Amino acid sequence: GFDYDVVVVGGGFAGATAARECGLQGYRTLLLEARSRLGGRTFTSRFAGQEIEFGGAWVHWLQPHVWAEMQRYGLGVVEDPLTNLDKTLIMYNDGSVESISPDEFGKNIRIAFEKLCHDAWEVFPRPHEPMFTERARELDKSSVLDRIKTLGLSRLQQAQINSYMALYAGETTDKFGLPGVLKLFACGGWNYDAFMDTETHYRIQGGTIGLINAMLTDSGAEVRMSVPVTAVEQVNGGVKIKTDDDEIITAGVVVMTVPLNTYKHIGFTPALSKGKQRFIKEGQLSKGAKLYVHVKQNLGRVFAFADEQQPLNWVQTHDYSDELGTILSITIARKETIDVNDRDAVTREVQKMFPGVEVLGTAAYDWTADPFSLGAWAAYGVGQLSRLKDLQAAEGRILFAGAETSNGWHANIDGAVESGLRAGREVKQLLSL
Numbered sequence: 001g002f003d004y005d006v007v008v009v010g011g012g013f014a015g016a017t018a019a020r021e022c023g024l025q026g027y028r029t030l031l032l033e034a035r036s037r038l039g040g041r042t043f044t045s046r047f048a049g050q051e052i053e054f055g056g057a058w059v060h061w062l063q064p065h066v067w068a069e070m071q072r073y074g075l076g077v078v079e080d081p082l083t084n085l086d087k088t089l090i091m092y093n094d095g096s097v098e099s100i101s102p103d104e105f106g107k108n109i110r111i112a113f114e115k116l117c118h119d120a121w122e123v124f125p126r127p128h129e130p131m132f133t134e135r136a137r138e139l140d141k142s143s144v145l146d147r148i149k150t151l152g153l154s155r156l157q158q159a160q161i162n163s164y165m166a167l168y169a170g171e172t173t174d175k176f177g178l179p180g181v182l183k184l185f186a187c188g189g190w191n192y193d194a195f196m197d198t199e200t201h202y203r204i205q206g207g208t209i210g211l212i213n214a215m216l217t218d219s220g221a222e223v224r225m226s227v228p229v230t231a232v233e234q235v236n237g238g239v240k241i242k243t244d245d246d247e248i249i250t251a252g253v254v255v256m257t258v259p260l261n262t263y264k265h266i267g268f269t270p271a272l273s274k275g276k277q278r279f280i281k282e283g284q285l286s287k288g289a290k291l292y293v294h295v296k297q298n299l300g301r302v303f304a305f306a307d308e309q310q311p312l313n314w315v316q317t318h319d320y321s322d323e324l325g326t327i328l329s330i331t332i333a334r335k336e337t338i339d340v341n342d343r344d345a346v347t348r349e350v351q352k353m354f355p356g357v358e359v360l361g362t363a364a365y366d367w368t369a370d371p372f373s374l375g376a377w378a379a380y381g382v383g384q385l386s387r388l389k390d391l392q393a394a395e396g397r398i399l400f401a402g403a404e405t406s407n408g409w410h411a412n413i414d415g416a417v418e419s420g421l422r423a424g425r426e427v428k429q430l431l432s433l
């Protein structure tokens with residue numbers, strides 16, 4: 001007596017995957033997306049006459065779940081040739097910028113990274129079972145900064161790795177859970193070069209939006225946008241779903257794939273488990289934002305790290321020419337450090353790194369301000385990883401997915417896909433046993 005067998009909440013990779021699994025089993029399926037677009041924390045846009053990625057975009061064949069889907073839908077990779085860099089810069093907490101030879105810059109980040117992840121084999125022999133070893137559980141008492149303090153790195157090496165880890169945290173490294181970081185490294189074959197190959201090297205042919213829609217089309221599911229879910233209530237036979245318009249939708253089961261930081265917007269009746277409530281109140285620690293700057297000058301192929309007390313923590317050349325100038329792709333760990341949508345504030349901070357540049361224009365997506373992300377990529381705080389089951393657990397007729405709920409590449413498109421396959425299996429169990 002329901003409108004649908006399955007309602008999937010959220011049109012990111014986790015929801016699109018869950019919808020495709022449910023739809024192909026014959027279940028009448030609906031996907032409700034709060035924004036007026038699909039993709040979630042993946043979003044391809046346009047800036048200065050060129051395509052840009054405001055959110056997630058980069059994949060790799062070491063990421064098993066997204067790669068299998070690419071082969072199901074016959075999508076290849078689109079390589080970002082990483083080239084020989086013209087410039088590598090480090091900006092320290094005090095704001096001083098230093099130019100390093102790219103080969104010595106690369107050597108020192110590898111030393112720091114390999115020292116940071118020296119024990120990945122022992123802690124995560126099975127990276128897709130994060131709590132398999134007691135050492136992983138014990139490490140969940142430490143932050144990343146706890147480890148960095150013991151590694152005896154140089155001032156350069158520490159700034160490099162701390163900027164890198166603050167990026168992965170979307171936060172200062174004293175708050176960043178350490179096992180989450182090692183686990184990702186382990187997922188990449190416990191190997192520096194293999195893991196690095198996954199970071200910003202390959203994109204999906206046809207974009208992330210193509211794969212999401214390839215799955216949703218395959219699913220046959222009904223898709224509705226601009227429909228934020230305000231409450232989910234467990235009532236006889238199914239669940240009852242409240243949009244904003246005081247529209248009411250019935251389903252046998254609901255798959256929630258919303259970002260953890262947005263559970264704040266949704267009333268649950270009855271109340272969810274106390275372990276899950278503790279997670280919703282904690283949230284995830286990323287406060288990242290994405291920004292593109294078009295400068296008049298041709299700066300060539302640049303790369304920069306900026307330490308956590310500075311705003312432009314990750315700078316890369318997206319494209320360059322004497323005609324164009326330079327389009328810089330910038331990721332900001334913490335949106336406290338700058339207002340990416342205030343252009344003069346952006347202009348001063350870019351000039352601190354490349355003095356005397358002229359900014360023609362800027363484009364920014366403040367993920368932490370967006371009510372339907374309120375944060376960026378998944379980043380676990382201290383002690384959160386060892387309780388991941390509490391967030392994964394089904395709650396009666398409510399199932400939970402999303403990249404935060406995956407076991408493997410939790411900071412990635414792939415963890416989102418992984419959670420979608422899990423949710424689809426759980427739907428089948430609930431609806432069919």
Ligand SMILES: Cc1cc2nc3c(=O)[nH]c(=O)nc-3n(C[C@H](O)[C@H](O)[C@H](O)COP(=O)(O)OP(=O)(O)OC[C@H]3O[C@@H](n4cnc5c(N)ncnc54)[C@H](O)[C@@H]3O)c2cc1C
Binds near residue numbers: 032035041266
């Ligand atoms: C700046 C940034 C850069 C990134 N770069 C990479 C990369 O290079 N490589 C990689 O692998 N990963 C990257 N990621 C991470 C990747 O994008 C995410 O892990 C993945 O997209 C999350 O998928 P998801 O389905 O779990 O959540 P989401 O994509 O966030 O989808 C959840 C959906 O739920 C919607 N929603 C929220 N609340 C409601 C509500 N009340 N009602 C209805 N709908 C709601 C949201 O609008 C959203 O569409 C990046 C993330 C960010 C923020």
